[PDB]
Symmetry: D2
Subunit: 460 residues, 4 copies
Amino acid sequence: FTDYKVADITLAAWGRRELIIAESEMPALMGLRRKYAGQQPLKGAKILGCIHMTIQTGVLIETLVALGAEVRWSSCNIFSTQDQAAAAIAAAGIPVFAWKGETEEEYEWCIEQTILKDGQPWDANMVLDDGGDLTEILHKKYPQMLERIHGITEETTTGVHRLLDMLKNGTLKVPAINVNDSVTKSKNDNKYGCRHSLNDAIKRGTDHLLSGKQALVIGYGDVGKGSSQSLRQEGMIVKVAEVDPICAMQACMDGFEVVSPYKNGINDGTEASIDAALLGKIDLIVTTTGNVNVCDANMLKALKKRAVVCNIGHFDNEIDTAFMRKNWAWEEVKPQVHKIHRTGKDGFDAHNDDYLILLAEGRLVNLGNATGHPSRIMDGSFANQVLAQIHLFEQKYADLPAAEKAKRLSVEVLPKKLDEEVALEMVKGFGGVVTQLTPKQAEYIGVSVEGPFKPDTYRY
Amino acid sequence: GFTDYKVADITLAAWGRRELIIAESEMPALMGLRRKYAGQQPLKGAKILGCIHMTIQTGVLIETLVALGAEVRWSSCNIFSTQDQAAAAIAAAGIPVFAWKGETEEEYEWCIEQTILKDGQPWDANMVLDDGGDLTEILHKKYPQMLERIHGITEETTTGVHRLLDMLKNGTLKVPAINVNDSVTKSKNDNKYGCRHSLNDAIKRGTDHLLSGKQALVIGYGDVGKGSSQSLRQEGMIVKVAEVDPICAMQACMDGFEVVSPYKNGINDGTEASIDAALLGKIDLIVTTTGNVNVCDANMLKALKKRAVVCNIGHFDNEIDTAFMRKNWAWEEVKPQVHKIHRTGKDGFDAHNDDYLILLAEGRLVNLGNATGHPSRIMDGSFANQVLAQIHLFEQKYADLPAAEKAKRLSVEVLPKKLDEEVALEMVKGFGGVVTQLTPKQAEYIGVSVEGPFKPDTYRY
Amino acid sequence: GFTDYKVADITLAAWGRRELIIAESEMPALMGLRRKYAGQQPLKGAKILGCIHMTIQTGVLIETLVALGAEVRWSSCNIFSTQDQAAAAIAAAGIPVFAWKGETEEEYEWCIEQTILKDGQPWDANMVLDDGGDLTEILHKKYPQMLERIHGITEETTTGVHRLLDMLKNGTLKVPAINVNDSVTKSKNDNKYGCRHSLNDAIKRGTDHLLSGKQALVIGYGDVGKGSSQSLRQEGMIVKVAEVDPICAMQACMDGFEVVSPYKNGINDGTEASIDAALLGKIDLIVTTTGNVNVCDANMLKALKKRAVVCNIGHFDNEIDTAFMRKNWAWEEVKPQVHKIHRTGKDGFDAHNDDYLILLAEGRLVNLGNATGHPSRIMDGSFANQVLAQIHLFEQKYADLPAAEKAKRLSVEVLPKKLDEEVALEMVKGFGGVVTQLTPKQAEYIGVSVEGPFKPDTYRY
Amino acid sequence: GFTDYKVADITLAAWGRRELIIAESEMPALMGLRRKYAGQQPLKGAKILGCIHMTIQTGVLIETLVALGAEVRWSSCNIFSTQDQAAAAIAAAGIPVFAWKGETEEEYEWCIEQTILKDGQPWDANMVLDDGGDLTEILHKKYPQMLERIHGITEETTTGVHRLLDMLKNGTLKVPAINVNDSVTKSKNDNKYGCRHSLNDAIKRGTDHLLSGKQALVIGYGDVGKGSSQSLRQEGMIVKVAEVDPICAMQACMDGFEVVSPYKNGINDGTEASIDAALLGKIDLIVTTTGNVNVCDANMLKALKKRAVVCNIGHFDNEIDTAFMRKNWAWEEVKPQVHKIHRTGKDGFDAHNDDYLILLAEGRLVNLGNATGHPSRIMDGSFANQVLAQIHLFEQKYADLPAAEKAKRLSVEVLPKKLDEEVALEMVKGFGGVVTQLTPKQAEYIGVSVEGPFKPDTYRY
Ligand SMILES: NC(=O)c1ccc[n+]([C@@H]2O[C@H](COP(=O)([O-])OP(=O)(O)OC[C@H]3O[C@@H](n4cnc5c(N)ncnc54)[C@H](O)[C@@H]3O)[C@@H](O)[C@H]2O)c1
Ligand SMILES: NC(=O)c1ccc[n+]([C@@H]2O[C@H](COP(=O)([O-])OP(=O)(O)OC[C@H]3O[C@@H](n4cnc5c(N)ncnc54)[C@H](O)[C@@H]3O)[C@@H](O)[C@H]2O)c1
Ligand SMILES: NC(=O)c1ccc[n+]([C@@H]2O[C@H](COP(=O)([O-])OP(=O)(O)OC[C@H]3O[C@@H](n4cnc5c(N)ncnc54)[C@H](O)[C@@H]3O)[C@@H](O)[C@H]2O)c1
Ligand SMILES: NC(=O)c1ccc[n+]([C@@H]2O[C@H](COP(=O)([O-])OP(=O)(O)OC[C@H]3O[C@@H](n4cnc5c(N)ncnc54)[C@H](O)[C@@H]3O)[C@@H](O)[C@H]2O)c1
Ligand SMILES: Nc1ncnc2c1ncn2[C@@H]1O[C@H](CO)[C@@H](O)[C@H]1O
Ligand SMILES: [Br-]
Ligand SMILES: [K+]
Ligand SMILES: [K+]
Ligand SMILES: [K+]
Ligand SMILES: [K+]
């Protein structure tokens, strides 16, 4: 077997050992594997996958394969691959092109090596994406391939928003499932995953004590909520910034002071609007917004000396790293850990005190400087991925008549009943015992003993 | 002189007025509406039947409605939830109010009827504000001609919304309603953080029990169960959580709680044999938060650790089978809303008996029964939604609409997210928080307006 | 059939008795001593003068001393700390008690006097139980002859112990004393976890203010300061901590608190220019825990954010400059032990004035003044130490020793660690905790006895 | 041509140097000692044998000692605790260091011997810095002639101090020691908050296991047990605590933990029947923190839930019975310092077997074995104390004292509280904290100097 490219194939045995441990940590995913392997629901599926080549993604991959699918995989971030996971997947005869520390050119090359097999476009019929990079490339560069694709399953908030923008503009060519907005994903992965992995990545990158220090978390959505708890539980004094008054209300009630980097919250683009007093005492800033330029150049210039700067949103443009590359000198401490000396661009003093520490060059810090979310959390997200892949592959959109295609070209979430069945296996994984409603109680609240237990409007 | 009221002690009015004045400083969203709309008088001509806990916070809501032009007739929607100084102060302002702490069930119904009737005849009401649905059902069952002239209902709580939705699907709902509960600045503020503040508060006032190091079982992990669990966990309790919803059960696990069931394998077999006796024999405190019926049943009560505290913070008392305890066990009142239930017999009890439970508020909502309910600054969000919902439904004038137009608008709706966000902003400003304003380029990037709304309607927060 | 007492309402005794019977189930260490030493009567012939907050918890302490054979005459050592139902139950049991909630300063000294004097002349006391040193000082400075018949003092709190040490240092202490405070089951239980339970409790009862999301400044980070900061932080307050001890400030930093000073660079020069007005203008709640004087001074009170809550949980009310506020600002009683201090003037205030502070318990012990102080299961440790200390000093019979032997026994020391561990063990058993027993090899490996003590006297826990 | 070292990879020096420069900015108490004492050179002539984990933090400690005039020869005090980039950077600085991560027990003793001997002969050492007492015991048993010229030992950890105290009790300690551990800026900073930081850190790096919602059992609740419990509880683990000290068990209860014993009724009768298999069958993670022997025994290991993680964060690896697991069960290495222990037999195993345990760091110090131990800003307090202890003992010149003077100073003591406070102050300033300065009236009121010390030696913090 040669249809792969990993950093070191001899890491396969290590990756296999961690895959075997991960299976015991992913009961909802392994429950689907045991339940569906006999009937082979993904028989005939050819899946283009673009998501962080981690140990957890390895278990997702082998689950899709155990259900009958062929895949060609790549990481959808340059720093997120676990090399031992990529090696184990390649050793199993699965086409994978990913390694930790890719260049932007090597990143595009890897996605092309999944799209292309033997120099010709692969005959793919399913897509699994994280952030929308593979989705955008197929729509703009290989639009003829989409004629044979039955659907897309998107992992993350940012990718879903891109899918919704294409649907609003009528440029989306195949239906998609919003995996992100399953509650066993958004309210599990996005929140508790970053709760687990944010302080994890900061410790591995810097070994900085967090207790007693001042943090500023930009954003208080699901990632911002989990990030803020990751820092607060370590004893940081966490301040939260937000543009959504509702999310800001939650930060207040959760015990956080809500502040803005700009005086009165108004960013007029000038340095005079920067709350220099506030930023001058922040030891750590974390961007969680999915927005652009939320930690801008003027904020970076006003930050306290030796503050840590990192992004746990999907894309690195949350921080203005381009400004830091152009104006400041970078000193690599170790991979994915850079000191940014604000003394100038041409040369730094090794003992300079006026620097910032940038993690993962602005990319997702939890995956860049650690291993991202743990297996038992990703279990929920990737069980939804398997269910979403099974659903769309069964619908066979690309083979339907155009009259039927237009009727089901949309971006849907999985039904709540499946969301609950994923949650149940997760709860059993903790040893939790859910109570069974009596018929009288189920009638009293208007639900089935079997569920679903909440209306679609319920926010949990 | 004004006599159209009934309260426990009118001489408490001065004390009530002082606390109302403090509460105004704690409710900036509510007082912001009072300042924005005072000149317009958007509720001029509104006659509001109100049934909601007669607390200091409800007083600020009442006086905001009156300040916007409305007349009201008020009662409490629980027998133990009235703050008597709040009721007295409202009555002293010439506002008809019929509420006192410690009503009998007979007096409870009388009080709601005193709002419905004025001088022995149906009041010329045209708006309804309800908490739990008791006033809504009485109008639908007993005064249907009054509902013809009523423009809408603004319902406060989850249980009342469910009753409204059941009436809607049955075609028995006569006027449209606004689901006030499902505003984020209500459900994810009041239900959760309000119970976080007030649950351990009520337990301390009632029992003065140390909570740290003791075992708690919280039945339910919805918004009330989440806040209730945090209320006990932050005090140092070892909290276990029961749930029928595996998604909520998943959140409990991730939040750091062991998820257990009072029944072996979660299955009630209709006998004591299915009770997890080892589990319940270690529980010092059980709190029901489900809005469901009989989630702390007789067989659970029998198996509870001696001297365990039993209370409910859902809307109705039937979460606990107190009827069983009235029928079978001897009650000893320690103080108002605090009873020792001796499991040794029905007739009497040894004064030093050790085999008793401590029931709070006789099973009624414990935060309002044994304390004062949610704090003003939290109720500010709920009651700002209530005022906005009263304005919107009153301006719609459903009662004046033709039959064909009424049918297009008979529904149970929530307020639009933009109003939910504007309520949250005033709450945030009350904390001194500074919301960031998006740049035009940032607003374009994430596809929203600079002024909001900032999330799609599907967003769960 | 008894008249040798003075309480607020004797008809409250039945209520107090019901709460005493509950508290007995919450105090296993104390009741454990009552069961153990019952038939032995180790306090036979003891006549104890007691000055400590007349709460339910002190009731079980008093009745334990009586059950061990002692006679007592009791007063409260704070004007606002008595639970009137507790004092009534103690009076109804035939024990002289002079205490009620809301004493004046002169009424306070009268009550201590009524325990010192029985039927016009000094009682033949031989033991002293004190909390703060007020009873101790009155005996030394106003009744020195009675100290010739007293076998010792058992002091409850940190401030009283400090006062005992200066007397020992200056050679004015006439009878030996036991530092009850510095037992670990006291200081590291009572002072810390008691205030954790009862601080937010008292603030809630007095004001019903939401704490989450607001700004608190805790002056001091000793045992009381540590528990107070947690009491507020666990409710979601943003807590800043002031300290003069860098080691305690270090703990505050590591515990997750920003360490600040009300004075610029920590230097108080008495001028308003030294006040960090930007800092104090953001504080919604200030809590003094120092045991020091004037740690929340006049300039801090002037610079505090409008409508901030000001309270004190250290033993003496002079931590806050309430004298300045009485002299310059107008006091509005919201309810007992809750006052609004209007900074707009002295001789009047607008009923709707916004520039006021809220002072709890008039600067006295806020947890005891506005709530019920520490819960029974926490006070169980402190008062089990008090009983053991009373037993030890009474058996020593200091006043009966020759002057040579007295000089060798005149000191202020703590109970042995072994007793500290035996109290702790009963508390752990009360929680259902199971302590592990060392094997013979393990005890030898770490060089301790299987029964204990398990730590050297230098261990800090 | 410096060759007097042995590290894993000298080319890691540049990376280790970069992290040392970062660490200097995180250790203001250590760097404050450098600036204050550099010109004075208080350690000129000192030749320090050092045995403590060769981390980046130790590198800053080493270079502070050298900056003050000391020469050192260094080894790590654990086979897994070295950071090879730290060891490489120290050797590149021309400092003799013999340490690498993953030594065999033979290489461990060889490394210590390489510091003791220079060019095959005893080095002219005169000071000892030790962590655990391994270097101390080797000198007392094998090189007593070197001890004659050594002025003192400065011991880092609780276990080492206990060994020193045993030698002092038995009259076998040959040089005086400073108990660095029992500084408050060590014991109550390093032992507690360091393990808080690094325990979950090590478990995450070794296993990447989610901790939220899982069951943990912490054996011991001293300072390391307190910090380990918080490390897990803050992640959302359900933490149960075991203890033989009832006072520490009391703190665990009050801190919100259930206190359990691995043995029925806490009595280990040796037999397999005394194991609480029901409890251990639910534990996902067990952490030993006792400094004792065999607190996680073979029967506990046989009863642990499948796939449970087993680790130790006490100083020595014999807290867990790893020798039993080597004799009976198959070890599968996942990766360095992570082993699956298959309970299905000693010879071989199935690659898909589910009956295994995960042992971290082969039972050695898990925080240093699987991560990097405590962060710089925490080690700053410990190592500022180490430097101060070295200066104090070196200036005393015990080895030069006559026999009569040596006898009056042969002891194991702690640094004076004033130095403890001055370390804490610099730590507090490192966080940006502002300590308040007492006014002369306040300092007189509580009886302390404005400069400190602010607490008596009995104070436990
Ligand atoms: N690294 C990970 O493991 C991980 C996991 C899930 C999602 N993500 C990514 O993280 C990002 C956030 O996802 P989410 O689920 O939290 O989305 P979300 O919609 O729940 O939260 C984003 C929040 O950012 C706020 N925000 C936007 N612009 C802002 C600004 N200028 N200043 C302050 N706040 C601002 C919004 O108000 C919103 O509340 C996305 O890009 C998503 O793909 C990363
Ligand atoms: N007292 C207060 O201050 C206050 C405040 C808000 C709401 N409420 C009341 O509290 C109740 C709950 O409100 P909510 O907003 O939390 O509703 P919710 O729907 O969000 O939560 C109810 C939860 O109970 C669970 N549940 C149902 N039956 C159960 C059973 N047998 N065992 C265990 N769990 C079970 C459901 O799965 C659900 O998650 C309602 O009656 C509401 O009116 C009271
Ligand atoms: N209300 C209660 O229930 C209760 C319980 C126990 C003790 N107390 C009282 O509380 C007080 C404190 O007791 P403790 O045991 O915590 O004492 P402590 O000695 O342990 O701590 C007091 C702290 O105050 C600090 N401090 C002193 N002056 C200061 C100043 N000007 N600014 C800032 N910090 C300052 C000291 O540095 C010290 O750390 C005593 O008076 C004690 O009697 C009250
Ligand atoms: N890894 C690190 O970074 C680090 C840091 C400091 C100390 N340590 C080591 O950790 C150990 C503990 O140190 P410490 O400062 O916490 O000491 P400590 O004396 O404060 O605590 C040890 C505790 O273990 C308890 N214990 C003893 N035997 C027990 C048993 N069989 N079951 C349950 N509990 C038992 C004791 O009662 C005591 O409270 C020492 O060996 C010390 O050298 C490690
Ligand atoms: N202090 C209070 N005043 C008025 N209503 C309250 C108070 N506390 C809780 N409630 C409301 O009571 C309802 C439960 O009956 C909840 O929906 C909640 O909004
Ligand atoms: Br049924
Ligand atoms: K991972
Ligand atoms: K209230
Ligand atoms: K009490
Ligand atoms: K480290």
